Design a protein around this nucleic acid. Structure first.
Ligand code: K
Ligand code: K
Ligand code: K
Ligand code: K
Ligand code: K
Ligand code: K
Ligand code: K
Ligand code: K
Ligand code: K
Ligand code: K
Ligand code: K
Ligand code: K
Ligand code: K
Ligand code: K
Ligand code: K
Ligand code: K
Ligand code: K
Ligand code: K
Ligand code: K
Ligand code: K
Ligand code: K
Ligand code: K
Ligand code: K
Ligand code: MG
Ligand code: MG
Length: 42
RNA sequence: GAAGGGCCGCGAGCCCCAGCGCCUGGAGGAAGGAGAAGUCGUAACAAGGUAUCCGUAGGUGAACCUGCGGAUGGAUCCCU
């Protein structure tokens, strides 16, 4: 339903920053096993 | 040449004032400890139901609450 020939959808770039409590509560990070804590893989 | 006397040198005793201990009375006031099985709440230990804890300031019956900066001994060793 656009009119512009060649129009593209604009994106968004937002950096989210949380504390530890909020991160765990909303599940951005999980409590891990003692072995698993040493893993830095994203 | 004795008693007796004068002035000083030595130096008791007492008085009087100040220091210096040590012990002790006291209306009230305010702590600590034990016997306790007495009221009132539930601050902490689990995310203890508002993560906990340090410094500081103020406030509330009580534990405690709140603001400003800090720490993990956290409930996160992990992402243009
Ligand atoms: K936190
Ligand atoms: K006294
Ligand atoms: K008793
Ligand atoms: K508390
Ligand atoms: K409370
Ligand atoms: K509480
Ligand atoms: K807290
Ligand atoms: K805690
Ligand atoms: K706190
Ligand atoms: K404080
Ligand atoms: K204050
Ligand atoms: K207050
Ligand atoms: K209060
Ligand atoms: K309080
Ligand atoms: K308060
Ligand atoms: K508080
Ligand atoms: K506090
Ligand atoms: K308050
Ligand atoms: K307040
Ligand atoms: K505070
Ligand atoms: K400030
Ligand atoms: K501190
Ligand atoms: K420690
Ligand atoms: Mg608590
Ligand atoms: Mg809590």
């Amino acid at each position: 339903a656009c009119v512009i020939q060649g129009f593209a959808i604009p994106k968004l770039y937002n950096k989210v920053q949380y504390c530890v409590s909020c991160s765990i509560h909303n599940h951005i990070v999980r409590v891990r096993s003692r072995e698993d804590r040493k893993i830095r893989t994203p």
